[PDB]
């Protein structure tokens, strides 16, 4: 009954299929359909991840960043699982997030999981 949810990125294409993971990022193209937007993950720019949102989006109740989970469709689409949008004042250090992910998961979360 336990479902894993790792953290991956573009540099991990191979993890998109059949692997329910955790996706984070700031909605760059704030699409108003409230069901499908374009976001940037933990980097500066050009992390153009398609986010097939939950059919409702609190587009103006919170800030830019949104987190969801699920499987990643090959065109970098994200199937909706669970929205956890934040009300952010201090934005991400995407450098810090990337170091955490691709360092812990590289060796120590690997040494853990």
């Amino acid at each position: 009954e336990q479902v894993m949810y790792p953290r991956i990125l573009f540099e991990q294409m191979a993890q998109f299929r059949g692997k329910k993971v955790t996706v984070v990022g700031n909605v760059c193209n704030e699409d108003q359909n409230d069901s499908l937007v374009i976001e940037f993950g933990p980097t500066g720019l050009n992390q153009h991840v398609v986010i097939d949102n939950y059919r409702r989006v609190d587009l103006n109740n919170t800030t830019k960043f949104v987190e969801i989970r699920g499987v990643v469709l090959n065109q970098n689409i994200v199937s909706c699982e669970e929205l956890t949008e934040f009300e952010q004042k201090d934005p991400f250090d995407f450098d810090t997030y990337s170091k955490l992910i691709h360092l812990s998961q590289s060796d120590k979360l690997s040494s853990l999981f």
Binding site: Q2, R7, D58, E67, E87, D90, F92, D93, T96, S104
Partner: protein, 149 residues
């Protein structure tokens, strides 16, 4: 001892170890990279199960690595108002569904139940990454300072 930051995966491992190994001349304690009895965790507060007969709210929780459930309790009036003290920051949103990223404390004891201690929400995932990297460094230094003490 001191409170340690943990996650669902490691606590599941520790619970399974407590199940299997009797750990003679020990017990009433969970030992990992050393030993511990209390934890701090940042995860998502899960579905609120309504259990009321002797115990109270069965608060579920889940991280990127697992899904666990803890308890709160009162008899008549002991933990209704403090239960609300914990629970306003969930209830007063009125639009968040009932799943938000949150940091809380738990008390470990050698018994198949986990008691919730204190709770608050997490508004920036900077703090979530903080909690994860802190717990990572904490186990690293704990293991390699107890073994290098």
């Amino acid at each position: 001892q001191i409170t340690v930051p943990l996650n669902c995966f490691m606590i599941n491992q520790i619970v399974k170890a407590a199940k299997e190994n009797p750990q003679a001349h020990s017990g009433n304690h969970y030992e990992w990279y050393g030993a511990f009895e209390n934890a701090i965790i940042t995860a998502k507060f899960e579905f609120l199960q309504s259990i009321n007969d002797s115990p109270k709210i069965m608060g579920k929780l889940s991280d990127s690595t697992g899904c666990i459930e803890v308890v709160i309790q009162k008899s008549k009036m002991s933990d209704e108002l403090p239960e609300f003290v914990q629970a306003y920051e969930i209830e007063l949103q009125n639009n968040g569904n009932r799943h938000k990223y949150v940091r809380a404390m738990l008390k470990m004891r050698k018994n198949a139940q986990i008691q919730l201690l204190y709770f608050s929400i997490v508004n920036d995932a900077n703090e979530i990454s903080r909690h994860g990297l802190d717990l990572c460094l904490r186990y690293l230094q704990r293991k390699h300072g107890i073994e290098d003490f």
